[PDB]
């Protein structure tokens, strides 16, 4: 699909039995979601943006369904103000910027 | 152009006769540049950040050239990790997300 930027590029994503509204975010290296129980080991990480840093848990090899596309990669979990799909998963689904 | 996301979508912009590198950022409502002086008329503003609001200076109706595509709009100046071009200007240059 083609998503214009008149409004926030928000899409529904699925992880397991879980639905989250998430922002397609070319400004983010990583994917960060709030309030998610995820399977597997995790390691502490700190990630920054405007305002400063938050502490997150890094989970690896997490399948994420994005508009019918299967992404599998690193998902960070913590107190992000909005759920974010970053470049690590955007690349896997073939997402580009075009103008 | 078409910009892929294996690397950060950094491009050259021209603003006030200066060339700068900026990140094309679909997760940002607004355009936020690193500390710099800019032509005339700014107002204090606060923008929502990580851990709370950050102070910026808001300049309205500023010409910004992005990969040789002309935009004129609001440019915020403050403490950002990197110069960020947000949807306010991305929309003006006809930028979309595609996959």
């Amino acid at each position: 699909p083609q998503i214009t930027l008149w409004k926030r590029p928000l899409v529904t994503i699925r992880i397991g039995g879980q639905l989250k509204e998430a922002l397609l975010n070319t400004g983010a290296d990583d994917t960060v979601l709030e309030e998610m129980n995820l399977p597997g080991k995790w390691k502490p990480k700190m990630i920054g943006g405007i305002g400063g840093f938050i502490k997150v848990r890094q989970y690896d090899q997490i399948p994420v369904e994005i508009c019918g596309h299967k992404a599998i990669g690193t998902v960070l979990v913590g107190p992000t103000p909005v759920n974010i799909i970053g470049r690590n998963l955007l690349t896997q689904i073939g997402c580009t910027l075009n103008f | 152009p078409q910009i892929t996301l294996w690397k950060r979508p950094l491009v050259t912009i021209r603003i006030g006769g200066q060339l700068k590198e900026a990140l094309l950022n679909t997760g940002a409502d607004d355009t936020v540049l690193e500390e710099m002086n800019l032509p005339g008329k700014w107002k204090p503003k606060m923008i929502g950040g990580i851990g709370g609001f950050i102070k910026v200076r808001q300049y309205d109706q500023i010409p910004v050239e992005i990969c040789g595509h002309k935009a004129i709009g609001t440019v915020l100046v403050g403490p950002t990790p990197v110069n960020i071009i947000g949807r306010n200007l991305l929309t003006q240059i006809g930028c979309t997300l595609n996959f």
Partner: peptide, 7 residues
């Protein structure tokens, strides 16, 4: 690391 989104 950087998740540079803004409201």
């Amino acid at each position: 690391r950087q998740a540079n989104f803004l409201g």
